[PDB]
Amino acid sequence: XXXXXXXXXXXXXXXXXXXXXXXXXXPRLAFVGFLGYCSGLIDNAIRRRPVLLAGLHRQLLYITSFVFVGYYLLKRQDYMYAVRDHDMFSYIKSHXXXXXXXXXXXXXXXXXXX
Amino acid sequence: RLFIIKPSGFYDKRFLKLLRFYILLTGIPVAIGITLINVXXXXXXXXXXXXXXXXXXXXXXXXXXXX
Amino acid sequence: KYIIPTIMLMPLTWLSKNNMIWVNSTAHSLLISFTSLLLMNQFGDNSLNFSLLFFSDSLSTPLLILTMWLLPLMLMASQHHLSKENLTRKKLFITMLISLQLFLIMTFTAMELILFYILFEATLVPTLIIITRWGNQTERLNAGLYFLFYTLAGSLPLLVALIYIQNTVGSLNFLMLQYWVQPVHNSWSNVFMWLACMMAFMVKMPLYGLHLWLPKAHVEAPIAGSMVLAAVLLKLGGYGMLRITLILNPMTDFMAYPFIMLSLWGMIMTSSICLRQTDLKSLIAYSSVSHMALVIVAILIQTPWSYMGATALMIAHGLTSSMLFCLANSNYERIHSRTMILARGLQTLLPLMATWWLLASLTNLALPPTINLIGELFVVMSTFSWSNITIILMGVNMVITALYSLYMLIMTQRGKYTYHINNISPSFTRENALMSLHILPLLLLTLNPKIILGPLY
Amino acid sequence: XXXXXXXXXXXXXXXXXXXXXXXXXXXXXXXXXXXXXXXXXXXXXXXXXXXXXXXXXXXXXXXXXXXXXXXXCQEKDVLCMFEAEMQWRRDYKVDQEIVNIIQERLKACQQREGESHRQNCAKELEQFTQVVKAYQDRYXXXXXXXXXXXXXXXXXXXXXXXXXXXXXX
Amino acid sequence: XXXXXXXXXXXXXXXXXXXXXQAERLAIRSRLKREYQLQYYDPSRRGVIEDPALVRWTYARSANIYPNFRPNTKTSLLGALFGIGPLVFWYYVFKTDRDRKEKLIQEGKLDRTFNISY
Amino acid sequence: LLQVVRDHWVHVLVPMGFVFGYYLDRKNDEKLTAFRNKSLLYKRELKPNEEVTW
Amino acid sequence: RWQEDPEPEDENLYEKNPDSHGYDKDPAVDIWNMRVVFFFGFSIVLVLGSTFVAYLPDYRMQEWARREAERLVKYREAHGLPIMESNCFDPSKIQLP
Known part of the structure; x- marks a missing residue:
């Protein structure tokens, strides 16, 4: 859902629903953490400094900033996908007539030659 | 006696020597591969009894190196 | 197991x-x-x-092993080149091959069509930088622009094709899930659905029409000859034609009928030009059109x-054409021109390389069962049915298959x-x-x- | 053995009555080479077979039968189809090598008779014609590449012809 | 291509114009040979000589593609009929053979009983 | 100890990268625990070992 | 006028100041690379890799199917009349039309 109906408008993270549990040491977090390290490699390409890998130790600021913002950004990702599924399952339960079930068949299909 | 037509030869003959030296270096497990059939038994055709389905090798016939 | 150690080649x-590298x-x-x-x-x-x-796993792809076979071989023939220039430039164009190897593994392994597409066109980016630089002769850009504007012009219709399938019929994803697919009813609205899935693979696998993508990439040499092996990998990189034709459109073969006839004439006319040509690299470039045309049939x-x-x-051509280009590179590093007539002299000056010239040439023909006899003859047997x-x-094409090889030998x-x-x-x-x-x-x-x-063998 | 039929027994007995000569060149060379290196090869094979002693029995052949056929479960669902599709592909891979055995029975007939060729046998000729015709109709051979979902349509196409022809007569 | 009599020594006259014509041919022949003579007979070289005539021969087929073809006329359309034309020629050959085959499978079987491969 | 550590530093990373890839890609099966004993195709009852095989 | 364009020079290792080598410059780097690790891949991937290829680990039921077929032939020959194929995976289908 795009427009809020049950969720509170303008939230820092969620706060209305907190129970979901965020991912711990996820493969998704590692890629954002890799980009934080990658940003601390190409910064020495702009301002000409000796060695991209073994240069200035202000790289720790670049890794942490990508992790801290990324953790909050992925927390919203797990939240928004949950609400999207929650409203989907509630739509089937309340209406029932919109959904139809079919199982087990013996229907003929056209066979291809050559 | 004549001086005759000249080729490089030194670069050419060395490569064939350098190639075969590393074939011979890994020609030892080729020699062991023959003795693996000789010393160790390969496989026998027999009906399986209901006790164990797979142990070490699940289903492999011929050559001990396959298992 | 496969990805991660390939990524660790970059650091x-x-x-x-x-001194090392x-x-x-x-x-x-x-x-x-x-x-x-x-x-x-x-x-x-x-x-x-x-x-x-x-x-994901391999179902009918031993072609991944070929990419792993060229994984060190794309570095061996490039040793003669790049050595004259800067040490930082050397490291850059080894890592562009590593990035190529990274994306090429991902294409064959991952059993998909949606995410496969963003790896299919992703191989074009590192090759573009490879082709547009280090080219000894001019018109790098008249081959570099043609490298993309042939492929991307045909492959961007996959976005309107693949997404259209998953929005109506379940989801593409695993392919092992793809049994939801119902046979196509065959209508005028269903014509452009089939064409958009095909035209993407009609470019990478060269035909008679829209085939000029390939000779421009080969004649205008990227780096020495080791990068031309990656251009061979791009031909077989469009392997999804094995997957789409079997699963997505099983009933549709009536619209395939004109495309077979196009590729059938891309066998006589593509071979005829591959006779009187001047460039040594071009006489491999046009023989690679006809050899990959057999697969499309x-x-x-x-x-x-x-x-x-x-x-x-796919495996036969991937190790025979790349073999021929290494022989073309070995003459290009000594004579400094790709002309066949000027670069003339085997056995007398090149005593041991001439036997490698013979073995590479005869493999284009049907030798004792190596791979090409299991490759070519199997198609000819299937065409009679x-x-x-x-x-x-x-059969006429089987006469001119000698005329690629022997004409390269005799001259x-x-x-x-x-x-x-x-x-x-x-x-x-x-x-x-x-x-x-x-x-x-x-x-x-x-x-x-x-x-x-x-x-299913 | 057991599965392969072949001939029951071969005669093969020499008489040698006409001409004294040096007995026979075929008989003298057979007796000489049997003890020269053929006896040594039999002794070396027996020495290696006895040296094995301990041997693993092993399961070899695997079971897994039926687990619901493809023409019983319908509608696009991964939970039911996957077990059914694996069963059909198991049968198709075996039936590729079933024909191979029957083909080799016809291969055995050609050599053993030679001069007779088509005049005798008849049993192997009839067995080959029955299976291949059934293989052509049931196990694809006309309906493109192998697919379990397309196989049910191929079986329905043969069933439709049987229902239409019998109703008229 | 050959005429009624093979050209080798047919129709030759001394004259005055023909005598100077052979002098013109030898003037270029000796000029291009001497620059080869100066390049071949020295140990200081070591390498493959360029020769501007041979490079222009390879340049004739590899290049000069789009600088040409600007007068299309009726000659280009005749070449199109020899190229795109034969592709349409087999369209009435392969389809007629397939329609012959497809009719046989449904009614009056022609396929062999001992057929199983593909 | 000083001669080996200073000269070789990048040489260790590639074979260790294979082990790191071996561990990471294997542990993905723990995410897909469904259908281990269920569905009769390779199903067998446990006697001593827990959950057949990983 | 070219000014700075003229700089091209022919370069070849061949044998001069190299004795016999494949790698450009330094004899110590050449021997340890071009003959050792170049031929170590020739010994592991080619010679030790020849044991695999397709021989040993069965490879997609090529050897398994032969033992499976033979026992199914002898069983069906003794009891049944039809050999293997008759009605493939079809037993009581719910109509056609």
């Missing part, structure tokens, strides 16, 4: 000292290629999925026998070399090693070609 070349990039790549054969070959009746859908028949010949020819007329056209088998004074040393220890690393894997496939053709 390997940069961290190592300036080439020793670390070649040796470490060889042990990863050994482990690819160790695990991927194991399969049951139907090949079961590897893990979660990021990189086999796919559109959809018979179980044809896919056996199709999968064989389609129509009786085919072998009258296909170099004259021991004159009056104008030429260079080429003192015949071949370095690495140069002779290149020629052996292409033919001897095919000579090992004589004993067991089960891992050379396997769609």
Whole structure:
């Protein structure tokens, strides 16, 4: 859902629903953490400094900033996908007539030659 | 006696020597591969009894190196 | 198991000292290629999925092993080039091959169509930078722009094709889930649905029309000859034609009928030009059109026998054409021109390389069962079940298959070399090693070609 | 053995009555080479077979039968289809090598008779014609590449012809 | 191509114009030979000589593609009929053979009983 | 100890990268625990070992 | 006028100040690379890799199917009349039309 109906408008993270549990040491977090390290490699390409890998130790600021913002950004990702599924399952339960079930068949299909 | 037509030869003959030296270096497990059939038994055709389905090798016939 | 050690090649070349570089990039790549054969070959009746859908198992793809085979070989022939220039420039264009190897593994492994598409066009980016730089002759841009504006013009219609399928019929994803697919009713609205899935693979696999993408990429050489092996990988990189035709459109073969006829004339006319041509690299460039045209014929028949010949020819051509380009590079490094007539002289000046010239040329023809006899002949046998007329056209092509190879031999088998004074040393220890690393894997496939053709084999 | 039929027994007995000569060149060379290196090869094979002693029995052949056929479960669902599709592909891979055995029975007939060729046998000729015709109709051979979902349509196409022809007569 | 009599020594006259014509041919022949003579007979070279005539021969087929073809006329359309034309020629050959085959499978079987491959 | 550590530093990373890839890609099967004993095709009852095989 | 364009020079290792080598510059780097690790891949991937290829680990039911077929032939020959194929995976289908 795009427009809020049950969720509170303008939230820092969620706060209305907190129970979901965020991912711990996820493969998704590692890629954002890799980009934080990658940003601390190409910064020495702009301002000409000796060695991209073994240069200035202000790289720790670049890794942490990508992790801290990324953790909050992925927390919203797990939240928004949950609400999207929650409203989907509630739509089937309340209406029932919109959904139809079919199982087990013996229907003929056209066979291809050559 | 004549001086005759000249080729490089030194670069050419060395490569064939350098190639075969590393074939011979890994020609030892080729020699062991023959003795693996000789010393160790390969496989026998027999009906399986209901006790164990797979142990070490699940289903492999011929050559001990396959298992 | 496959990805991650390939990614670790990137910090390997940069961290190592300036005197080394080439020793670390070649040796470490060889042990990863050994482990690819160790695990991927194991399969049951139907090949079961590897893990979660990021990189999946191989069902009918022993072609991944070929990419692992060229993984060190794309560094061996490029040793003669790049050495004159800066040390930082050397490290950059080894890592562009590593990035190519990273994306090429992902294409064949991952059993997908949605995420496969963003890896299919992703191989074009590193090759573009590779082609547009280090080109000794001019018109790099008249080949570099043509490299994308042929492929991307045909492949961008996959966005309107693939997404249209998953929005209506379940989801594409695993392909092992893809049995939701119902046969196409065949209507005028369903014409552009089939064309958009095909036209993407009609460019990478060259036909008679829209085929000029390939000769421009080969004649205008990227770096020496090792990058031309990656251009061979792009031809077989469009392997999804094996997957789309079988699953997405099984009933649709009536619209395939004009496209077979186009590729059938892309056998006589593509071979005729490959006779009177001047450039040594061009006479491999046009023979590679006809050899890959055989595969396109086999796919559109959809018979179980044809896919056996199709999968064989992908590996057969991937190690014979690349072998021929290394021989073209070995003459390009000595004579400094790609002219066939000027670069004339085998056996007298090149005593041991001439035997490698013979073995590479004859493999284009139907030799004792190496891979090309299991490749070409299987398609010709399958075409008769389609129509009786085919072998009258296909037999003429079998005459001109000699006319690629023998004309390349004879125009170099004259021991004159009056104008030429260079080429003192015949071949370095690495140069002779290149020629052996292409033919001897095919000579090992004589004993067991089960891992050379396997769609339900 | 057991599965392969072949001939029951071969005669092969020499008389040698006409001409004294040097007995026979075929008989003298057979007796000489049997003890020269053929006896040594039999002794070396027996020495290696006895050296094995301990041997693993092993399961070899695997079971797994039926687990619901493809023409019983319908509608696009991964939970039911996957077990059914694996069963059909198991049968198709075996039936590729079933024909191979029957083909080799016809291969055995050709050599053993030679001059007779088509005049005798008849049993192997009839067995080959029955299976291949059934293989052509049921196990694809006309309906493109192998697919379990398309196989049910191929079986329905043969069933439709049987219902239409019998109703008219 | 050959005429009624093979050209080798047919129709030759001394005259005055023909005598100067052979002098013109030898003038270029000796000029291009001497620059080869100066390049071949020295040990200081070591390498393959360029020759501007041979490079222009390779340049004739590899290049000069789009600088040409600007007068299309009726000659280009005749070449199109020899190229795109034969593709349409087999369209009435392969389809007629397939329609012959497809009719046989449904009614009056022609396929062999001992057929199983593909 | 000083001669080996200073000269070789990048040489260790590639074979260790294979082990790191071996561990990471294997542990993905723990995410897919469904269908281990269920569905009779390779199903077997446990006697001593827990959950057949990983 | 070219000014700075003229700089091209022919370069070849061949044998001069190299004795016999494949790698450009330094004899110590050449021997340890071009003959050792270049041929180590020739010994592991080619020679030790020849044991695999397709031989040993069965490879997609090529050897398994032969033992499975033979026992199914002898069983069906003794009891049944039809050999293997008669009605493939079809037993009581719910009509057609």
